[PDB]
């Protein structure tokens, strides 16, 4: 009469599966059964996530002080494990579902905010933006390899680019933001905003 | 092949009285599905209000309702039970009786016929 | 607490457009969304039981979409019989929450 795991996954990829009719229940308990076998297929295809040992634990053990499982004690799950995430600077995560494999095991999906594309957009002395690849080929150096698609954006890479450009003192403001992409469900776009002095 | 529910029970209450509503399960193995209690006030939208755990008796209920109400089920008949305590005007509505099969992760498919409980002096 | 806010409180549309009811979920807690269809005097039907999948015995004019905290449900061609009130519902474990619903009417 509890809850044993809770399973933290990344979710991106696609997803299938269509259906029938004549709905015969001792039938159907077919398909509801594929979804739920289904589920365990993508539980394990996915990726785990960043969470450390210590926040499972500790998450764990509030599902532990409160022997039922309510929607009020998931939502301080939540506000805890987003707190780990973007204290360590993963300000793109969030929790995006609540699944089940059973009443006993449950299923928490987050979206960590993996690069998806690079941008570089720069700006001519008064702000207006502009074009010119002159600059992009010595900005594509002096950026960590944390920063490329591939990887999950963190704010702490955001700043050793924002000191590495900023030590060739060309550009007279010089900007890090990750924006949603949206050709990408859940995916980020690091666009790099570079000020030219005069 | 789609046999279905029939909601009984229901009826003119008073303020503070109490009643019991059944809800029959014919056709369908109730372990694999939860049966959810879901109320309509008289022209206006849907609240749910009760639910049991498929397998398990956890016993979920809306805050609305907490500590009058109490869910239950009985495997042999194949019966799911709603008691109704300290009734109050707000609790007058049209009671459904829906099941979903797991737990809440599906959708409420097959519902009752319905049942009218009217709480008045 | 969670809460969906179920827009159109009303639209009126005529028998052959493509009409888009819109819920939003106030929180990303859930994907288990579900659309059901109700005819006045009668029992709530299933329409779309995960966020966008189709049930059994529904016609295909009716679809589902998901962007984010924002749920869609959609109706390619109206026909007479689509003409009822419309209910979204979400399963936050416990909490089973519905949209406040949408009337679709006659045009006129």
């Known amino acids: 009469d509890r809850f044993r795991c809770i399973n933290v996954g990344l979710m991106v990829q696609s997803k299938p599966i269509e259906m029938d009719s004549d709905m015969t229940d001792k039938e159907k308990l077919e398909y509801y059964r594929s979804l739920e076998k289904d589920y365990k297929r993508r539980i394990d295809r996915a990726r785990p996530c960043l969470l450390p040992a210590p926040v499972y634990g500790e998450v764990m053990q509030m599902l532990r002080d409160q022997g039922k499982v309510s929607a009020r004690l998931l939502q301080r799950i939540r506000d805890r494990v987003q707190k780990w995430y973007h204290d360590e600077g993963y300000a793109c995560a969030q929790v995006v579902n609540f699944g089940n494999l059973n009443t006993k095991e449950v299923v928490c999906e987050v979206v960590e905010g993996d690069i998806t594309q690079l941008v570089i957009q720069f700006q001519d002395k008064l702000g207006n933006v502009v074009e010119g690849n002159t600059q992009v080929p010595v900005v594509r150096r002096e950026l960590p390899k944390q920063l490329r698609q591939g990887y999950v954006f963190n704010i702490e890479a955001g700043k050793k680019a924002l000191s590495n450009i900023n030590s060739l003192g060309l550009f007279s403001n010089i900007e890090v933001n990750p924006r949603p992409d949206e050709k990408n469900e859940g995916g980020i776009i690091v666009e790099i905003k570079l000020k030219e002095l005069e | 092949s789609e046999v279905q529910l029939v909601e009984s029970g229901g009826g003119l209450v008073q303020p503070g009285g109490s009643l019991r509503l059944s809800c029959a399960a014919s056709g369908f193995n109730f372990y694999y599905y939860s049966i959810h209690w879901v109320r309509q006030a008289p022209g206006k939208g849907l609240e749910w209000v009760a639910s049991i755990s498929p397998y398990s008796g956890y016993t979920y209920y809306a805050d609305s309702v907490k500590g009058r109400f109490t869910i239950s089920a009985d495997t042999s008949k194949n019966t799911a039970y709603l008691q109704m305590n300290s009734l109050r005007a707000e609790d007058t509505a049209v009671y459904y009786c829906?099941?979903?099969?797991?737990?809440?992760?599906?959708?409420?498919?097959?519902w009752g016929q319905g049942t009218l409980v009217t709480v008045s002096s | 607490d969670i809460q969906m806010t179920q827009s159109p409180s009303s639209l009126s549309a005529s028998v052959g457009d493509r009409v888009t009811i819109t819920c939003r979920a106030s929180q990303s807690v859930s994907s288990a969304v579900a659309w059901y269809q109700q005819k006045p005097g009668k029992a709530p039907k299933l329409l779309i039981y995960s966020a966008s999948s189709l049930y059994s015995g529904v016609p295909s004019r009716f679809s589902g979409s998901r962007s984010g905290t924002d749920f869609t449900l959609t109706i390619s061609s109206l026909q007479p019989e689509d003409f009822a009130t419309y209910y979204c519902?979400?399963?936050?474990?416990?909490?089973?929450?519905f949209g406040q619903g949408t009337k679709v009417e006659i045009k006129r």
């Open positions: 519902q979400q399963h936050f474990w416990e909490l089973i929450t």
């Open positions: 829906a099941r979903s099969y797991g737990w809440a992760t599906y959708g409420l498919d097959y």
